Write a protein that binds this DNA or RNA. Structure first.
Ligand code: NA
Ligand code: NA
Length: 95
RNA sequence: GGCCGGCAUGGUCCCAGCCUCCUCUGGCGCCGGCUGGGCAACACCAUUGCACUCCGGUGGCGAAUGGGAC
């Protein structure tokens, strides 16, 4: 149900009908206040659909990005967000 | 999107209209067969999925007009 506080927040239960680049921008449009986002990862695959990965620089940013945006409607769909199971490749490059 | 066959139709331009997965001298008379490339768009079904490798599948072409200048 919940993982240990990661740099990336695993957001799922998103709108499938929305295109990749459009959704990748609209998420940034409402998430660019908690902290500096490195890159959002959006896929259109079979199982990889419906979810996204918002990589945050500061951990405290992703901490407040999860608790505030939880259940917030997005394209007529409530956002089900979690912490990432493992650190992202960009974060792995840091330390 | 490409081929074939049966039939029907005097023929060349002009205005506007109309069609579609497959360029907006593209195509737009009926009936019947053969067959391809791609899911990019649109639709629908499946999927509640932890990724850093791009990657589910299917339908649609079984489509579309009159009038005029000679
Ligand atoms: Na041929
Ligand atoms: Na698809």
């Amino acid at each position: 149900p919940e993982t240990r506080p990661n740099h990336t927040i695993y957001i799922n239960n998103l709108n499938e009908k929305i295109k990749k680049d459009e959704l990748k921008k609209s998420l940034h449009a409402i998430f660019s206040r908690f902290g500096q986002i490195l890159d959002i990862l959006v896929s259109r695959s079979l199982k990889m659909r419906g979810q996204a990965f918002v990589i945050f620089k500061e951990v405290s940013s992703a901490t407040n990005a999860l608790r505030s945006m939880q259940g917030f409607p997005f394209y007529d769909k409530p956002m089900r967000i979690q912490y990432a199971k493992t650190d992202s490749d960009i974060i792995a490059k840091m330390k």
